[PDB]
């Protein structure tokens, strides 16, 4: 058991704490310099473990006054070995993050501290920058809206606080470079993650896409918006609520065909009109207005489901965002075009050493074992949990639940106890706020739209009689400090209103009230017609719901409804598990291709003279054309060399260089050798005329432009195949093997096209 | 809007009749035009016989609305203001060392399609020069059309010089003075000086029988 090893390590930490206290200032920075010089002599990271943890403990005492406990040293040494150190919520994990990032950044490689959203990153950045700048290291906060040079200066530091979106987009924009100095990242060394459950389990489903703007079309969107606006709802389109999708009925198809004047909707000529109709219908029905986006300055900003914030850069795909812009008469803008694609699993698997603290990862320990090769070290609490959590109060129809939670927060407001009202969607928080407008209770709503006052709202949410309605921004890492006189009456009565997508998220929301052994109250509230229950509930118990009457003055008391709630939540977790596993084992193939392509692109960026590279590509495409004509299985002396010599004189060589009598039925290897000799002489002429450098820049531009274009076409075709392979699993074969074989064939076609294009662009210019 | 409505591909009918020195010519043709890329792919057929004046002296007479515009010069176009209402253009084309074309064309969306109805009258000619001697190479160069506006006529006056590769090894510098008129009278857009950077390509079809000109052409604008 490694816990005893961590415990005796912590005892050693306390032993060296016993004599490090009497050290004066300015020797701590001298101790950092001493560690830096002693490291490269013969020492490793594990040799300098105890003294570094003791000196950073002493530095924390001298700077911030928060002396780390015994368990935080155990978490730090667990984070050094590369294992997930699951600590319970509110146990002070931030200094536990400061320990091994001070240990591992003495090499000078660079250590990335990753978390979920922006404000949490900035708060941890300023506090641990105040800690680390006393030691003598450089801490650079990475943002979303920085410049290229600001990002370059940030990753040049020792410790880079950043979110996961910015790190992913910086790696992905790090492989669309036309130079080398415009690169922003260092080599990848280390990544201490916070909230590993969310990043590597919850939002590991959605991959990262970068897109540039393509050509713009307009007429189909507004025509489809008018047609969908005249559609009479339930009779003409179905709307399944088990999964968010809509399709036209037969009468809707007849109305669609008689509206646009076409004869058949599902003809192959009218694929664009049908696609626009379907996307406009999905934008008009499935996407509610304030549950999944907002309206800002004529633009549409989508609201992330996982972190709860709004991300100003990321539109939707497949023309869905244009239909949302056409829903409210806004200025429709350009269309997207995929440039690069990476998931979070492969990107964090490139990091070569990583670890991460969390709050609730004990449920997913086998998934952390199978994928990232890590195990979950449970860690004690140093003080017993007094966070009392009552069981759920399941209600009938939703306005009864809102009345009950309004009565609860009213009876708790007149006692001085602060209450954080959790929510999930955005507009329902405003519904609770305007339901609290009557009875006169002051409050600060924390929406996705009111996000700029977040720091003062959060620090003001721990005083006497504070009421805070907050959506998922307050979910993951919001630290609410208990103010004055509040611990007497058991402060921070956290009241949720919706069962979340998984047990970890609402368990974190429950754990928001604990805060180092302080008394808190955690009550939930559910509805029988709630979105989760109506979206994933079992159909057998739906008839039993009407058996309990309808007055909604009291919650239901039954074990059947609790069993149905837990079964529905576990079904949602099972669906997310299946989607995660399927997306990972489908993206493994694209990982294997993408690593090779980025490796060759980075190889041809920093070459002093890549004459041999274009020589090898030209001769490979040349001999492939040589074998494309003149086949082994026909005969000699009927190979039709006129077409081949025309192809050589137009594509590879100049016009007046060759005829049929130059070869006229020779061996193919010697004839491609002769063509290679003439190409070598011509390229020597081009090199001696352009000089050494301008020719190099010219073919570098040619290679990079062609490689980017064909890689974009390949990733688009790969996604188009990825839908069809899930369809293709109908004959009794597993689809993943067929996907791998077809992906390899398309990769070969792409690399043959890349060699042909670079040959015919170098040799004719 | 108007031609912002026609971002997709556009059918192009060209009809030309004309007379030079009492000698008849009649050439027609059909193709496609695109605005978001801004190109013209046109298959043209001489449906009267043989060319009195050759095809390179014809190509500036052969539909200037199919330019490619980047984001900033979207305000500064005239050729999306008179369309779909219709367009009229006449040119004085002075050949140095030879006579003069007066060309007479209306370029308009008839029904849907872009029809260029051209009648060309070429006067002041001596037959023993270069053009009726057919001294032209089968090619056309790259150019810059200078565009300005006049407000007494509220139309567009275009100035440019063009350069024909003569088969003796010389060039015919010939200057176009171009007058550009709306047909409808809606929102007119009269911008400042700018220029169409244009380039062309003349080729043929190996599986076609008669004397036909295949035109492929790129237009871009710049300046404003």
């Amino acid at each position, epitope marked *: 058991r490694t816990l005893n090893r961590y415990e005796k390590i912590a005892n050693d930490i306390d032993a060296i704490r016993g004599d490090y206290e009497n050290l004066s200032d300015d020797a701590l920075k001298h101790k950092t310099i001493e560690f830096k010089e002693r490291l490269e002599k013969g020492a490793t990271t594990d040799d300098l473990l105890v003294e570094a943890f003791a000196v950073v403990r002493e530095a924390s005492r001298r700077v911030t006054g928060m002396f780390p406990f015994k368990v935080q040293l155990m978490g730090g040494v667990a984070l050094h070995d590369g294992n997930i150190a699951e600590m319970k919520t509110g146990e002070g994990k931030t200094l536990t993050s400061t320990l091994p990032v001070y240990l591992n950044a003495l090499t000078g490689k660079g250590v990335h501290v990753v978390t979920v959203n922006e404000y949490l990153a900035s708060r941890d950045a300023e506090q641990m920058g105040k800690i680390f700048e006393f030691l003598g290291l450089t801490v650079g906060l990475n943002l979303n809206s920085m410049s290229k040079d600001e990002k370059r200066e940030a990753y040049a530091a020792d410790i880079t606080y950043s979110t996961n979106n910015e790190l992913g987009f910086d790696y992905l924009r790090d492989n669309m470079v036309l130079y080398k100095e415009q690169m922003v990242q260092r080599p990848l060394h280390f990544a201490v993650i916070d909230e590993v459950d969310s990043i590597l389990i919850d939002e590991a489903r959605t991959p990262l896409i970068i897109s540039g703007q393509a050509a713009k079309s307009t007429k189909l969107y507004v025509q489809a918006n008018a047609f969908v606006r005249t559609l009479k709802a339930e009779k003409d389109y179905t709307y399944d609520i088990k999964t968010k999708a809509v399709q036209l009925t037969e009468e809707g198809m007849t109305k669609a065909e008689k509206a646009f004047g076409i004869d058949n909707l599902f003809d192959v000529k009218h694929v664009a009109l049908n696609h626009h109709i379907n996307q406009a219908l999905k934008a008009h029905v499935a996407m509610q207005k304030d549950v999944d986006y907002v309206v800002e300055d004529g633009q549409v900003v989508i609201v992330d489901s996982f972190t709860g914030r709004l991300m100003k850069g990321r539109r939707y795909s497949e023309g869905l965002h244009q239909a949302i812009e056409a829903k409210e008469g806004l200025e429709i803008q350009n269309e997207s075009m995929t440039l690069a694609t990476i998931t979070f699993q492969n990107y964090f698997r490139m990091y070569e050493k990583l670890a991460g603290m969390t709050g609730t990862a004990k449920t997913e320990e086998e998934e952390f074992r199978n994928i990232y090769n890590m195990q979950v070290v449970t860690i004690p609490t140093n003080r017993p949990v007094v966070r009392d959590d009552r069981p759920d109060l399941i209600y009938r129809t939703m306005e009864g639940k809102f009345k009950a939670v309004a009565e609860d927060v009213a009876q708790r407001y007149m006692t001085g106890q602060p209450v954080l009202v959790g929510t999930v969607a955005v507009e329902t928080s405003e519904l609770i706020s305007k339901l609290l407008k009557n009875k006169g209770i002051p409050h600060q709503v924390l929406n996705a739209k009111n996000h700029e006052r977040e720091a003062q709202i959060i620090e003001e949410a721990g005083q006497k009689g504070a009421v805070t309605i907050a959506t998922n921004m307050a979910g993951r890492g919001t630290d609410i400090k208990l103010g004055e006189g509040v611990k007497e009456l058991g402060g921070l009565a956290v009241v949720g209103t919706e069962r979340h997508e998984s047990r970890r998220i609402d368990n974190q929301l429950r754990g928001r009230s604990g805060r180092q052994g302080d008394p808190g109250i955690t009550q939930f509230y559910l509805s029988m017609e709630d979105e989760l229950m109506r979206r994933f509930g079992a159909e057998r118990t739906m008839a039993m719901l009407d058996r309990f009457g309808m007055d909604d003055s009291t919650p239901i008391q039954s074990k059947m409804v609790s069993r149905a709630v837990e079964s529905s939540q576990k079904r949602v977790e099972g669906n997310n598990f299946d989607s995660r596993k399927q997306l990972l084992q489908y993206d493994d193939v694209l990982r294997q291709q993408r690593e090779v392509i980025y490796k060759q692109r980075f190889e041809v960026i920093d070459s002093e003279n890549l004459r041999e590279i274009v020589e090898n590509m030209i001769k490979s495409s040349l001999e492939r054309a040589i074998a494309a004509y003149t086949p082994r299985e026909e005969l000699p002396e009927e190979w039709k060399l006129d077409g081949l010599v025309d192809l050589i004189n137009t594509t590879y060589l100049d016009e007046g260089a060759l005829e049929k009598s130059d070869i006229f039925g020779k061996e193919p290897d010697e004839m491609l050798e002769l063509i290679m000799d003439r190409i070598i002489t011509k390229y020597n002429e*081009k090199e001696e*005329q352009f000089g050494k450098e301008q020719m190099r820049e010219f073919e570098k531009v040619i290679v990079l432009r062609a490689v980017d274009s064909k890689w974009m076409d390949h990733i688009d075709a790969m996604d188009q195949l990825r839908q069809g392979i899930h369809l293709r699993a109908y004959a009794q074969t597993n689809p993943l093997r067929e996907y791998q074989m077809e992906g390899f064939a398309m990769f070969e076609h792409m690399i043959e096209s890349i060699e042909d294009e670079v040959a015919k662009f170098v040799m*004719k210019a | 809007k108007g031609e912002e409505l026609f971002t997709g591909v556009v059918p192009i009918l060209v009809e030309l009749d004309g007379d030079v020195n009492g000698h008849k010519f009649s050439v027609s043709g059909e193709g496609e035009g695109d605005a978001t890329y801004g190109k013209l792919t046109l298959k043209f057929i001489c449906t009267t016989g043989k060319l009195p004046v050759p095809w390179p002296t014809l190509v500036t007479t052969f539909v200037q609305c199919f330019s490619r515009y980047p984001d900033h010069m979207k305000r500064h176009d005239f050729f999306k203001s008179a369309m779909p209402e219709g367009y009229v253009q006449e040119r004085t084309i002075s050949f140095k060392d030879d006579g003069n074309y007066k060309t007479r064309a209306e370029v308009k969306f008839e029904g849907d399609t872009l029809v260029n109805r051209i009648e060309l009258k070429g006067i002041d000619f001596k037959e023993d020069g270069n053009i009726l001697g057919h001294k032209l190479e089968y090619n056309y*160069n*790259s150019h810059n059309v200078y565009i300005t506006a006049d407000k007494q006529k509220n139309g567009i006056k275009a100035n440019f010089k063009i*350069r024909h*590769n003569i088969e*003796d*090894g010389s060039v015919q510098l010939a200057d176009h003075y171009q007058q550009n008129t709306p047909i409808g009278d809606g929102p007119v857009l009269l911008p400042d000086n700018h220029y169409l950077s244009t380039q062309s*390509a003349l080729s043929k079809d190996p599986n076609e029988k008669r004397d036909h000109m295949v035109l492929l052409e790129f237009v871009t604008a710049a300046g404003i």
Partner: nanobody
Amino acid sequence: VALVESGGALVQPGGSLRLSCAASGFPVNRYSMRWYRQAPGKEREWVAGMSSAGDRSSYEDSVKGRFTISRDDARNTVYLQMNSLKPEDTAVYYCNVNVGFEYWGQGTQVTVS
């Protein structure tokens, strides 16, 4: 199909020097190559050029009987000449061929003083 040119230097009006322009990517043998010049403030004008594989050669009237455009097929380039020049012909000289598109040289500046 990118023209690279050289041979430009500060010259007296009593000396004769050759102006070279290398053709790269296409043969000299079957295309008409022309020489242009453009002074600072002057518009780019045609000076000389020969067609039909160099048996008939035309020149402008300012250097007619003075200049001579020559070429070599093995060297795949052309040669101009600055015989009997004047300070009026101070310009940046260009070579121009038309193979499908029209490609210009980068420009060789010659100044006379």
